[PDB]
Design a binder for this molecule. Structure first.
Ligand SMILES: CCCCC/C=C/C/C=C/C/C=C\C/C=C\CCCC(=O)O[C@H](COC(=O)CCCCCCCCCCCCCCCCC)COP(=O)(O)O[C@@H]1[C@H](O)[C@H](O)[C@@H](O)[C@H](O)[C@H]1O
Ligand SMILES: CCCCC/C=C/C/C=C/C/C=C\C/C=C\CCCC(=O)O[C@H](COC(=O)CCCCCCCCCCCCCCCCC)COP(=O)(O)O[C@@H]1[C@H](O)[C@H](O)[C@@H](O)[C@H](O)[C@H]1O
Ligand SMILES: CCCCC/C=C/C/C=C/C/C=C\C/C=C\CCCC(=O)O[C@H](COC(=O)CCCCCCCCCCCCCCCCC)COP(=O)(O)O[C@@H]1[C@H](O)[C@H](O)[C@@H](O)[C@H](O)[C@H]1O
Ligand SMILES: CCCCC/C=C/C/C=C/C/C=C\C/C=C\CCCC(=O)O[C@H](COC(=O)CCCCCCCCCCCCCCCCC)COP(=O)(O)O[C@@H]1[C@H](O)[C@H](O)[C@@H](O)[C@H](O)[C@H]1O
Ligand SMILES: CCCCC/C=C/C/C=C/CCCCCCCC(=O)O[C@H](COC(=O)CCCCCCCCCCCCCCC)COP(=O)([O-])OCC[N+](C)(C)C
Ligand SMILES: CCCCCCCCCCCCCCCCCC(=O)OC[C@H](COP(=O)(O)OCCN)OC(=O)CCCCCCCCCCCCCCCCC
Lengths: 183, 469, 86, 50, 127, 87, 89
């Protein structure tokens, strides 16, 4: 029963692991395949948190369009790459370690509002209390999450859908207009 | 009415030939003119600083933003006249200054993305409109693709705009993680006391500001401004500056900011002493943009800065636009044209300019003494009204560093004059073909605004007293 | 916008505390928002549960120090296939 | 045709002739300013996509 | 334990088992003339890089902005009853803004590859 | 870089003993004992020199037998700026 | 918030210290965007609203169009120079 407890933490570790194989892989398209694996780990986490809708939107849109675009580029184009030699990146290692420490801690800092800096960080780790889920019988219809997105994209934020249409238009016009060579 | 222009235009450009492209831009030029003339009267809505929120807590319309809107239309009428009109009727200038088919498409989509920031209340409206204008600057840079430098600059601008878009997005979602809210309208001056929103709002400001050219991260923008051709770069210099700055001046999230104050000091320093020993005119001319974007970052620290801002905006826009238009005209008089996209580069190429079209040097002088802040010209009241806001509000070390930065920045402004009023051995005696009447009238109009624009200072302030108070 | 719209389209978890704070700010001019502090404090701790976690670690630190531990009507945990067993 | 070109601090700056685009001038080491050898000039391109 | 996840665990073990029975049961026995790619019974030099047409790359670059619309029409189709008469017009306008960019694409003939097989248009003018 | 392990002999011997029970031909466990025994040549014998042959050396002929398992800057980029890549 | 922050920071440092090719820089940008998504989607679930899910479903599409635009920028960069450098642009 408690084998099903650490899943979220496992995915975190697994996601960490995947990024080290992205930035360090001899072949490029092997590392882009590791990125596809990282999208799959993300969709695992999104089902695992309770958002089963998004996981399939990630597998549809990111894996099935953006990664297919990337692999399709790497095939018929020329990209040189150098291996992860120790001699070229051992000079980077100290600024890597300093930036790991600072950017990690300072990303963990703004979730919290004590004026004292050390009290900001420890509130990042005090999560071990279990939220209580109560059944309320106030809702009468199966408004899923995608229904509510389609109500708020279409009434309250219809202009954002319409400016978004201008952006999708631009994403059509642009690549065309570069790669035409008209006449 | 930009929407109707884009929807009509790209259908119309799909059916026109290549040779029609020029004349298409002429049409759009006149179109935007009759959006200024026949639609200005909407300023009557904005009496006594009445503000509207349209599309449901989404776009905020005040008269500050109405003025920014009108300024962006005026400068586009200029830039569109630069593409749509011939300089001369030579076989030379047809292959040097020639618009692409889809150029005006990306222009109007860019102005759309730049207006949906200054008018913006929401953060996702902010994010979508920054993304729209960032794509448009990507594609306006890469549209002259048969150039090595422009393609390298478009790639550089892509990655450095991607980082500072994900920093803005991280700041928006960091703000959301502590407040279930999207507006800075929710802040309402009680919350800032009891909530540590310093690091959030400051990081949001920074991720918006590093796209301007603020000075720790200024080298990549000077490289893009030198690598792009001479017509693309008077647009991509001006538009993200006035759009992003008139966002951040409207919403006052960095007041008593120590980080914005450091970066303002550092900007005024390494902008004035950056562009001193430089020999390329777009370089020289792009560190003038770094210092004059430094004078804005001061006004972000301010409360109630809407006079100093707007006046120094239209100052910098007219002066900017005029000094780029002057070195378009000096191309006929140089003895050496390289690099078809960027025909004048080195600042010693305009050397004998007083002996050939001396009133181009009168024009050049009048605009460059206005960058320095000489009092009969319009640039001085801009620097003056910035100084009146800086000293009012306790920024005393900022003020003397402003002054030292203005004095250092006068050197490489006067280097343009030093080179221009010199002896040249071979002077022009007569020219067969002359310059476009409707296009040189624009430079004459842009000077007479700078020269004789201190006249209306009184009138403007009284008008400023009614519609913003 | 979607200020208080929940996942099912309803009102979110801290809507009532937020609408109470907006009642507080509606009837109140500036230089007198210092009375509007407890509604804001209630809203922020509805969001993040900071005072609640503080109180629970204050009582959990006492719970581990007792050798008796629990003398109360206890809480019994069940496996998921045994909701209504007995 | 000056004796010495000026550079806003009295420095000596190079006068840019057609003679600055050769093979030794190609891929030199320098900051992006004060540099000759543009990548786009009609003697450096020389049938660039033929 | 539903019967949904036995399946997603259970297809791979079948595939790993069929790959394993091939690796275990067939011989291996290779050499150099067996190795090497197939082109019609003739070896050749492969060129290091080859050129391509702009329409080949343009199909899949252009594919994604149409795909992102088709997944943007997916929130609407689930909420189509709630936004009666109003979200209808917004989705109309959204689709029309898309359709005019599409008619830009079809007017430019962006995905069409021309043929350089011209039948010698120019006639025979003599002397 | 071909792999190298060099684990002790008795564990290695027991591993070969384990792998003897499989149908395809595996490394022998008495081939472990021949890893110690080296080339002991009888001087009272006749070599290649008798029948008029000179044997070919291993380094001259390593390249031919190992050919299928073989895996595989600025002047190119100055020369590739004249070709056409997009048509 | 741990998984989104760790994906963002590790992807950011892998982007910064990229010297080996350019497609690693693109995919480090996309993994960053995934991390910002993860942080926001969790904040939506914990706060009981679609609001951050609204910003999420918009930034999905904007990440898509960013990929489409920028990879066409790369094809334009590659058109004049038949090889992409290892050290970078
Ligand atoms: C990109 C890719 C995305 C990357 C994500 C990973 C990381 C992201 C974080 C980075 C975000 C971007 C970084 C931006 C720069 C940081 C900006 C920043 O410091 O604001 C600071 C926060 O004052 C801390 O208390 C700040 C203390 C912070 C703690 C320092 C870090 C701890 C390291 C432990 C070792 C505030 O400014 P400010 O001048 O207005 O603050 C002043 C002044 O400090 C106060 O005394 C006044 O009371 C106040 O009114 C104001 O006048
Ligand atoms: C508050 C301040 C805000 C804005 C103020 C800015 C501008 C003022 C607004 C409107 C100004 C309107 C001006 C219209 C009247 C101006 C005017 O005489 O015609 C034009 C220029 O005409 C524009 O260039 C028309 C271009 C108008 C674009 C102005 C944008 C700057 C100048 O005559 P022109 O002798 O050179 O024209 C002649 C003649 O027309 C031809 O027949 C000949 O063949 C040819 O040789 C040509 O030289
Ligand atoms: C205490 C200090 C007292 C300060 C007094 C003000 C000094 C102003 C001053 O030095 O003239 C200037 C500007 O120098 C600044 O950049 C302007 C002054 C920058 C510092 C402002 C004054 C500091 C006040 C700090 C409070 C010195 O360059 P400059 O023109 O001679 O430089 C050269 C040179 O003289 C000629 O030989 C060359 O032919 C020519 O190219 C020319 O450019
Ligand atoms: C039946 C009814 C249902 C049908 C099931 C599928 C049909 C199965 C029918 C299969 C019959 C066996 C056909 C397989 C067969 O003969 O290859 C003979 C095996 O010689 C047996 O020692 C044959 C021993 C094979 C062990 C029996 C496995 C039964 C099939 C299980 C499924 C090949 O010798 P071999 O050692 O040189 O082959 C080895 C070996 O194949 C590779 O693993 C090594 O990598 C390679 O070096 C190579 O040397
Ligand atoms: C038949 C309509 C004709 C179309 C007019 C289109 C103009 C587009 C040009 C925009 C930039 C140019 C500067 C315009 C200044 C308007 C001042 C104003 O009044 O600004 C005020 C406050 O300004 C500011 O903060 C400071 C701006 C200071 C400008 C500094 C430049 C001074 C020199 C040029 C001005 C005098 C030239 C007159 C020549 C006879 C608020 O703006 P407002 O809401 O009252 O707009 C007025 C509606 N008006 C346009 C239809 C009348
Ligand atoms: C599904 C069930 C899983 C079955 C996997 C079993 C793998 C066994 C195959 C094997 O022994 O390795 C074969 C592999 C061939 O590659 P190689 O010979 O080095 O190069 C040839 C290029 N023409 O040789 C290798 O280089 C090894 C690569 C895979 C590493 C697995 C090592 C297997 C050890 C056997 C004990």
């Amino acid at each position: 029963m408690y084998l099903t407890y650490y899943f979220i933490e496992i995915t975190i570790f697994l996601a960490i692991l995947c990024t080290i194989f992205i930035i360090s892989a001899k072949n490029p398209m092997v590392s882009i395949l590791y990125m596809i694996a990282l999208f799959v780990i993300a969709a695992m986490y999104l089902y695992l948190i309770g958002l089963g809708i998004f996981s399939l939107l990630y597998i549809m849109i990111y894996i099935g369009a953006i990664a297919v675009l990337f692999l399709f580029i790497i095939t018929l184009l020329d990209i040189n790459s150098t291996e992860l030699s120790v001699k070229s990146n051992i000079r980077d290692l100290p600024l890597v370690l300093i930036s790991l420490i600072v950017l990690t801690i300072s990303g963990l800092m703004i979730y919290s509002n004590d004026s004292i800096l050390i009290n900001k960080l420890l509130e990042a780790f005090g999560n071990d209390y279990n939220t209580i889920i109560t059944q309320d019988w106030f809702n009468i219809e199966n408004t899923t999450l995608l229904t509510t997105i389609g109500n708020v994209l279409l009434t309250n934020n219809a202009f954002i859908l319409l400016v978004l249409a201008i952006v999708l238009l631009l994403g059509i016009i642009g690549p065309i207009s570069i790669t035409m060579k008209h006449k | 009415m930009l929407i109707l222009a884009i929807i009509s235009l790209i259908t119309f450009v799909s059916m026109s030939k290549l040779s029609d492209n020029r004349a298409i831009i002429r049409l759009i030029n006149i179109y935007l003119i009759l959006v200024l003339v026949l639609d200005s009267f909407l300023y009557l809505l904005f009496l006594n600083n009445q503000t509207y929120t349209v599309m449901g807590e989404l776009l905020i319309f005040n008269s500050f933003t109405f003025y920014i809107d009108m300024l962006i239309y005026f400068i586009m009428i200029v830039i569109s006249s630069l593409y749509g009109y011939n300089l001369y009727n030579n076989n030379l200038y047809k292959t040097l200054f020639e618009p692409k088919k889809e150029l005006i498409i990306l222009f109007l989509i860019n102005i759309l993305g730049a207006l949906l920031i200054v008018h913006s209340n929401d953060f996702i409206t902010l994010f979508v409109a920054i993304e729209l204008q960032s794509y448009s600057i990507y594609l306006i840079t890469a549209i002259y693709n048969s150039s090595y430098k422009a393609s390298k600059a478009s790639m550089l601008y892509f990655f450095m705009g991607g980082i500072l878009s994900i920093l803005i997005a991280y700041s928006i979602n960091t703000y959301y993680s502590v407040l279930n809210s999207y507006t800075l309208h929710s802040l309402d001056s009680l919350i800032i006391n009891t909530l540590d929103l310093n690091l959030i709002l400051i990081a949001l400001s920074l991720g918006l500001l590093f796209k301007i050219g603020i000075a720790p991260l200024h080298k990549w923008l000077i490289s893009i401004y030198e690598n792009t051709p001479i017509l693309i770069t008077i647009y991509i210099s001006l538009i993200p500056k006035i759009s992003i700055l008139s966002y951040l001046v409207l919403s006052n999230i960095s007041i008593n900011s120590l980080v914005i104050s450091i970066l303002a000091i550092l900007t005024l320093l390494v902008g004035s002493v950056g562009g001193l020993l430089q020999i390329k005119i777009k370089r020289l001319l792009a560190f003038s943009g770094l210092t004059n974007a430094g004078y804005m970052m001061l006004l972000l620290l301010l409360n109630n800065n809407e006079f100093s801002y707007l006046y120094y905006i239209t100052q910098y826009s007219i002066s900017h636009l005029a000094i780029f238009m002057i070195i378009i005209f000096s191309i006929y008089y140089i003895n050496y044209i390289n690099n078809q996209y960027n025909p004048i580069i080195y600042v010693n190429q305009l050397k004998g300019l007083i002996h050939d079209n001396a009133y181009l040097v009168l024009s050049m002088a009048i605009v460059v003494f206005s960058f320095i802040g000489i009092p009969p010209l319009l640039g001085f009241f801009g620097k003056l009204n910035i100084l009146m806001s800086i000293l009012n509000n306790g920024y005393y070390f900022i003020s003397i560093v402003l002054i030292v930065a203005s004095l250092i920045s006068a050197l490489y402004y006067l280097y343009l004059l030093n080179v221009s009023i010199q002896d040249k051995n071979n002077i022009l005696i007569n020219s067969n073909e002359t310059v476009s009447s409707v296009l040189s009238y624009i430079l004459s109009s842009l000077i007479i605004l700078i020269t004789f624009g201190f006249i209306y200072n009184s009138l403007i302030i009284d008008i400023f007293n009614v519609y913003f108070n | 916008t979607a200020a208080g719209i929940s996942l099912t389209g309803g009102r979110n978890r801290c809507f009532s505390e937020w609408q109470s704070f907006m009642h507080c700010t509606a009837k109140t001019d500036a230089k007198s928002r210092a009375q509007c502090l407890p509604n804001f404090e209630d809203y922020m701790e509805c969001l993040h549960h900071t005072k609640e976690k503080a109180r629970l670690r204050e009582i959990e630190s006492v719970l581990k120090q007792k050798k008796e531990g629990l003398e109360a009507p206890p809480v019994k945990v069940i496996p998921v296939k045994a909701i209504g067993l007995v | 045709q000056d004796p010495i070109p000026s550079g806003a601090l009295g420095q000596k700056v190079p006068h840019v002739d057609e003679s600055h685009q050769d093979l030794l001038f190609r891929t030199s080491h320098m900051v992006e300013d004060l540099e000759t050898y543009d990548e786009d000039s009609p003697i450096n391109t020389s049938d660039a996509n033929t | 334990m539903n019967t949904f996840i036995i399946f997603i665990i259970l297809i791979p073990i079948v595939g790993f088992a069929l790959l394993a029975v091939n690796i275990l049961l067939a011989v291996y026995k290779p050499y150099n003339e067996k190795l090497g790619a197939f082109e019609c019974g003739l070896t050749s030099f492969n060129q290091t890089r080859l050129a391509f047409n702009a329409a080949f790359i343009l199909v899949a670059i252009l594919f994604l902005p149409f795909d992102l619309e088709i997944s943007t029409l997916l929130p609407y189709v689930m909420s189509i009853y709630l936004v009666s008469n109003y979200g209808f017009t917004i989705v109309l306008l959204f689709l029309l803004i898309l359709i005019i960019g599409f008619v830009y694409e079809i007017n430019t003939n962006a995905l069409k590859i021309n043929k350089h097989n011209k039948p010698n248009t120019d006639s025979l003018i003599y002397k | 870089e071909v792999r190298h392990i060099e684990l002790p002999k008795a564990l290695y011997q027991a591993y070969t003993k384990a792998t003897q029970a499989i149908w395809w031909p595996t490394y022998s466990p008495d081939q472990v004992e021949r890893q110690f025994l080296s080339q002991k040549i009888d001087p009272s014998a006749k070599t290649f020199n008798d029948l008029d042959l000179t044997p070919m050396e291993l380094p001259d002929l390593m390249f031919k037998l190992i050919r299928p398992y073989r895996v595989n800057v600025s002047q190119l980029e100055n020369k590739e700026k004249t070709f056409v890549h997009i048509l | 918030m741990f998984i989104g922050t760790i994906i963002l920071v590790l992807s950011f440092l892998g982007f910064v210290f990229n010297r080996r090719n350019i497609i690693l820089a693109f995919i480090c940008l996309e993994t960053m965007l995934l991390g910002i998504n993860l942080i926001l989607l969790r904040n939506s679930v914990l706060f009981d609203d679609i609001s951050g899910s609204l910003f999420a479903i918009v930034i999905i599409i904007l990440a898509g169009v960013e990929s489409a635009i920028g990879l066409s920028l790369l094809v334009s960069y590659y058109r004049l120079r038949g090889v992409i450098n290892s050290y970078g642009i």
